[PDB]
């Protein structure tokens, strides 16, 4: 632990008593360990409590069917309701439909919560330090790491912990700390102390925050502090929920919901005065209220029927299985909404180096000039063996291994990639590998250096750790390197300003080293490197050196090259300003050209399918990229955004290409075109702006700080799991995994939800439309009564519960990879579907009331009251309006009614069924694809047969039926909405439309 950024550089070092380049030794992580433990926090537990969890019943529709339950629980506390103890069942049929859909919700939300927090704890993070134990820099475990020890930050990275700068390697070092401060844009720092001890975050400008991101620059520090002492740890806990609100299409569905209150609520205060008539009747002695207050509880008992009570949980639902099934894919998601919106995504663009490509790059050909005579020129070509990090490998020439030393082109060739060079080689002693401190690219030149060996340096009898770095160090102890022009993507180059060592020759010359894009760097070049010779830069010259460049990237290697040069006079210092990033071009002019190398870096394995999938799903994929534009139409070409031999003039665009087009033509471009080439940072986020403005869903796939802009455009952006913490911090999912394949598999499981939700909607509404109908159809057709409050309470727990919530589970449709993607703004419901409500809803309508009916009529157990209904219920009591006075009150029976209540349940069971997928028959997508829907069916019929048959309980809701002969009729008047539906399903798809 230190106190201060308020002390010095030295200071700081005192305090700890570490030497600044070496790091600290073996014992001294030991004692900083015991005294300051493990840089973590300990939290990494709790969050949502599992009462916390249970309420979301503070939803919409639930509160409703949450006060109805007050109300039946009050007008049955008033010792009445009709029926004694049928009074607080009532309650109790409503409650219960809430706690088993809360139930399935909250182990949804379990499971998610879990599935994501082991894909998030799989993978550790990492820091580099130097520790006493190594010369060149190492990675660790980020929990490794302890006050007092040297740590190495760059551009991408995650600060690993609270850390008092020492030395910044490039000219400026921004920082980006929204995370901790809120301060939007990155922030520049220095390793000036700042006095003030009480000072806030904001002004610790020689400090680097845990938590916060490196957007520019590259720093070495010491950590101050760790853990919980850490200046994001002391502030974890505290924040009033920094946690956003829901999903558009959670919104959608919510507002769907909101006018479906409306409608219910006025077909109720309908019912109530449709029947204010039947309010003097004999069947409530006709009060002047016991006759009111029934139909009230009629409407009501209506309401929780048609209210569809489970919509809200079941959105919920989905949603949280979407991620639980995304992180079984390694895909982390890090906002709710990138699943549904994946969904309808039509584009995806996609950054290529490392996010396309597997970004393992090694160094297979590199060239130098050989001979220079008039329009004549020749190069010496080399092959260069091994495509992993280990600096084991031959340089070849003509088949033949050479000693690099030999040829004074590739001395200097090497010095270049050794000096002008921010990264390094670290060995992993436990899993045996040479990996990367740094950037790829980077890297394979590193492990190039190793392999030239180009002044013959004794290496045979060095350590694993040692060898990653030994000839590189060999140059840099040959040259004193004064500073550092960093990278930059305008320039598409980086420069390194050096003196010779010993200062023993303090005149032999001062040099720059260059390194970048072949293109600019070669333009800038006015001479050509010829040994240990140099002669002036000539068109023919220029000539060989690019088309071997074409060549290479163009060939069946698709080689990402690099120009190497020198100036071999570079300004004095004094007269170069380091402030302005954008005069470092002119510095790096009058250059003399040394070579060319060529780099390997292999696509992914399952890209070229991921987009075949794509193509099918009729999403378009394009690549987007700072390499040059041969490479990168070629590499197209292999994953199969290009044909093999598709022409491509006006489909591939360089920045310079796009930006010499009316802005007008832009737009199109990004339209037709895929590839796009050596276009910076502002040019990717401009591209997906274009897409967007065809009002289209766009994807941004990528890695890099180049990407951050525009992952944070785009729809859905997503990073990979190799990539930079910025690019982290700029998306939606992170594919730890790298894999691309995921991607598709996204967009599926939100196309997939969104149908499931759909088929959820069009269950309860033409299922509950039906029962509706059925209250209106006796009523109007002047018939008995169908249902009794009760009754009605009892189809809505059996038919609205688990069967409904059940379809959430349900199976992609067969074609929903193969159809385009829906446009976000179309109407939740289509003009045909409401269509399919009605007449589904029609024959449940009129298929309860003709049982009702038929238990009158031509049921023998029943009276054979025959057609026309004998007309009225003018009877009564004893023999009125004398047409055949045969039976007395039959009506009120509870046969007639116990008829209706079992074809409601049953034929809403049967066309459950329907809703297993759009429009395919239960013949391609039978019943069994949703085992869920079927258990949680034969849970409702069963619950059903209880009811009936357990002697207590008849008595509650009206007494049983015929096992043998009633349920014969009952199937037979329901099964046939299964038919109805099945010639609808074939209606729209025969003929096809949506
Ligand atoms: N560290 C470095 N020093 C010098 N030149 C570099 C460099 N890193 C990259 N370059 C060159 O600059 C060019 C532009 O880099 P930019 O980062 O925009 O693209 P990229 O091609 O490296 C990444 P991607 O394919 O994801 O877009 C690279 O193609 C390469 O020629
Ligand atoms: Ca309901
Ligand atoms: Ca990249
Ligand atoms: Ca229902
Ligand atoms: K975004």
Same mark, same amino acid.
């Given at each position: ?19 600044? /380049?070496? &790091? ?21 537990? +709790? ?6 969890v249970?309420?979301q019943?503070?939803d919409?529709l639930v509160?409703?069917?949450?006060? !109805? ?28 439909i809430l706690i088993a859909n809360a139930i399935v919700g909250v182990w949804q939300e379990r499971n998610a919560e879990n599935a994501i927090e082991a894909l ?27 006050? +007092? ?71 070495? +520090? ?8 850490? @200046?994001?740890?002391? $502030? ?10 829901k999903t558009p299409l959670q919104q959608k569905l919510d507002?769907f919901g909101?006018?479906l ?15 204010? &008539? ?29 209210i569809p009570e489970g919509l809200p949980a079941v959105i919920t639902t989905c949603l949280a299985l979407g991620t639980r099934r995304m992180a079984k894919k390694n895909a982390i998601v890090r906002s709710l909404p990138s699943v549904e919106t994946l969904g309808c995504t039509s584009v995806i ?23 220079? *005579? ?100 060999? $140059? ?77 990237? /163009? ?12 100036? *071999? ?31 390997? *870096?292999?696509?992914?394995k399952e890209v070229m399918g991921s987009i075949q999938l794509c193509r099918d799903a009729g999403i378009r994929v ?26 491509? !003039? ?13 802005? !007008? ?21 401009? $591209?997906? @702006? ?7 869903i766009?994807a941004?796939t +990528? *890695? ?11 729809e859905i952006?997503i ?13 939606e999912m992170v594919l730890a995994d790298?894999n691309f394949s995921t991607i598709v598999a996204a967009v599926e499981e939100g196309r997939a939800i969104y149908n499931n939700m759909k088929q959820f909607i069009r269950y309860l509404i033409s299922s509950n439309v039906g ?24 189809v809505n727990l059996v038919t609205d519960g688990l069967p409904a919530t059940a379809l959430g589970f349900n199976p992609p449709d067969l074609d929903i990879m193969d159809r385009p993607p829906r446009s976000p703004k179309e109407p939740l419901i289509s003009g045909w579907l409401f269509f399919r409500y009605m007449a589904i809803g029609?024959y449940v ?5 003709? !049982? ?52 409601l349940v049953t034929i809403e069971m049967c066309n459950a069924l329907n809703s297993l997928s759009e429009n395919q028959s239960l013949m391609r997508m039978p019943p069994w694809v949703n085992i869920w829907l079927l258990g949680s069916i034969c849970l409702s019929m069963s619950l059903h ?26 199937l037979?008047?329901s099964l046939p909405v299964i038919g109805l539906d099945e010639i609808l399903k074939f209606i729209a798809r025969n003929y096809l439309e949506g």
């Amino acid at each position: 632990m230190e106190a201060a950024h308020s002390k010095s550089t030295e200071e700081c070092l005192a305090y700890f008593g570490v030497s600044e /380049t070496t &790091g600290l030794t073996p014992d001294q992580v030991k004692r900083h360990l015991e005294k300051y433990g493990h840089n973590e926090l300990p939290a990494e537990e +709790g969050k949502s409590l599992w009462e916390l969890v249970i309420e979301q019943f503070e939803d919409l529709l639930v509160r409703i069917l949450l006060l !109805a339950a007050c109300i039946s629980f009050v007008l049955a506390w008033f010792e009445e309701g009709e029926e004694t103890i049928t009074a607080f069942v009532e309650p109790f049929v409503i409650l219960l439909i809430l706690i088993a859909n809360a139930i399935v919700g909250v182990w949804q939300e379990r499971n998610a919560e879990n599935a994501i927090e082991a894909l998030k704890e799989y993978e550790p993070e990492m820091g580099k330090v130097y520790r006493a134990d190594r010369k060149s820099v190492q990675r660790i475990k980020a929990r490794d790491i302890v006050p +007092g020890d040297i740590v190495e930050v760059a551009v991408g990275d995650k600060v690993p912990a609270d850390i008092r700068i020492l030395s910044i390697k490039s000219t400026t070092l921004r920082v980006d700390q929204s995370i901790l401060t809120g301060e939007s844009v990155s922030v520049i720092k220095h390793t000036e102390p700042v006095p003030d001890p009480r000072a806030v975050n904001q002004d610790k400008k020689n400090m680097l925050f845990s938590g916060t991101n490196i957007a520019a620059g590259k720093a070495l +520090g010491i950590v101050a502090t760790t853990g919980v002492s850490t @200046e994001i740890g002391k $502030i974890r806990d505290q924040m009033a929920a920094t946690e956003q609100d829901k999903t558009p299409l959670q919104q959608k569905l919510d507002e769907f919901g909101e006018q479906l209150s409306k409608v219910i609520s006025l077909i109720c205060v309908a019912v109530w005065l449709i029947n204010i &008539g039947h309010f003097n009747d004999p069947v409530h002695g006709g009060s002047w209220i016991r006759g009111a207050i029934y139909y009230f509880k009629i409407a009501v008992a209506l309401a929780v029927a048609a209210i569809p009570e489970g919509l809200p949980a079941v959105i919920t639902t989905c949603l949280a299985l979407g991620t639980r099934r995304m992180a079984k894919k390694n895909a982390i998601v890090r906002s709710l909404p990138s699943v549904e919106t994946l969904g309808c995504t039509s584009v995806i663009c996609s950054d290529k180096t490392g996010t396309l490509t597997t970004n393992q790059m090694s160094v297979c050909k590199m060239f130098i000039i050989d001979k220079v *005579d008039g329009d004549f020129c020749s190069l010496n070509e080399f092959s260069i063996t091994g495509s992993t990090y280990a600096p084991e490998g031959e340089v070849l020439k003509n088949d033949k291994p050479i000693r690099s030393g030999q040829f004074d082109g590739l001395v200097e060739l090497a010095t270049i990639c050794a000096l002008c060079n921010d990264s390094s080689l670290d060995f992993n002693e436990t899993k045996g590998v040479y990996e990367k401190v740094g950037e790829a690219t980077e890297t394979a030149l590193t492990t190039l250096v190793e392999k030239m060996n180009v002044f013959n340096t004794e290496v045979r009898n060095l350590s694993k750790v040692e060898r990653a770095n030994a000839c590189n160090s060999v $140059i840099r102890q040959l040259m004193k390197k004064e500073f550092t022009l960093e990278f930059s993507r305008d320039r598409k180059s980086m420069s390194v300003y050096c003196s010779p060592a010993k200062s023993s020759r303090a005149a032999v010359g001062n040099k720059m080293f260059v390194k970048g894009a072949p293109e600019g760097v070669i333009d800038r070049c006015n001479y050509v490197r010829v040994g240990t010779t140099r002669v002036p830069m000539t068109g023919p010259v220029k000539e060989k050196i690019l088309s071997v460049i074409k060549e290479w990237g /163009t060939g069946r290697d698709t080689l990402r090259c690099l120009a190497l040069a020198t100036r *071999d006079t570079p300004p004095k210092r004094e007269e170069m300003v380091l402030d302005d990033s954008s005069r470092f071009m002119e510095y790096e002019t009058d250059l003399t050209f040394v070579g060319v190398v060529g780099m390997l *870096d292999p696509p992914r394995k399952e890209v070229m399918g991921s987009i075949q999938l794509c193509r099918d799903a009729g999403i378009r994929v394009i690549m987007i990229t700072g390499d040059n534009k041969g490479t990168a139409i070629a590499i197209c070409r292999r994953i199969g955004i290009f044909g093999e031999n598709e022409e491509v !003039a006006d489909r591939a665009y360089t920045g310079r290409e796009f930006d010499d087009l009316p802005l !007008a033509e832009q737009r199109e471009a990004c339209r037709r075109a895929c590839c796009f080439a050596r276009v910076e940072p502002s040019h990717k986020s401009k $591209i997906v @702006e274009y897409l967007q403005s065809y009002d289209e869903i766009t994807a941004m796939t +990528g *890695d890099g700080v180049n990407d951050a802009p525009a992952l944070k455009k785009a729809e859905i952006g997503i990073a990979m799991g190799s990539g930079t913490a910025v690019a982290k911090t700029a998306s939606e999912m992170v594919l730890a995994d790298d894999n691309f394949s995921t991607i598709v598999a996204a967009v599926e499981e939100g196309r997939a939800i969104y149908n499931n939700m759909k088929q959820f909607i069009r269950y309860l509404i033409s299922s509950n439309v039906g029962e509706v109908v059925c209250i209106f159809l006796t009523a109007a057709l002047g018939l008995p009564e169908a249902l009794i409050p009760v009754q009605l309470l009892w189809v809505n727990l059996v038919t609205d519960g688990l069967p409904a919530t059940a379809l959430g589970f349900n199976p992609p449709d067969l074609d929903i990879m193969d159809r385009p993607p829906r446009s976000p703004k179309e109407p939740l419901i289509s003009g045909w579907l409401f269509f399919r409500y009605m007449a589904i809803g029609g024959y449940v309508g009129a298929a309860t009331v003709g !049982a009702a009916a038929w238990w009158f009529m031509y049921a023998e157990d029943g009276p054979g009251v025959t057609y026309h209904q004998l007309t009225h219920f003018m009877q009564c009591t004893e023999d009125h309006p004398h047409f055949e006075g045969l039976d007395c009150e039959i009506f009120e029976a509870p046969e007639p009614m116990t008829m209706a209540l079992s074809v409601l349940v049953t034929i809403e069971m049967c066309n459950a069924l329907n809703s297993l997928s759009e429009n395919q028959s239960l013949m391609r997508m039978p019943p069994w694809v949703n085992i869920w829907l079927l258990g949680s069916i034969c849970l409702s019929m069963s619950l059903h047969f209880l009811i009936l048959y357990v002697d207590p309980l008849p008595m509650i809701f009206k007494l049983k039926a015929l096992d043998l002969t009633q349920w014969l009729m009952v199937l037979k008047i329901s099964l046939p909405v299964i038919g109805l539906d099945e010639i609808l399903k074939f209606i729209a798809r025969n003929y096809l439309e949506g």
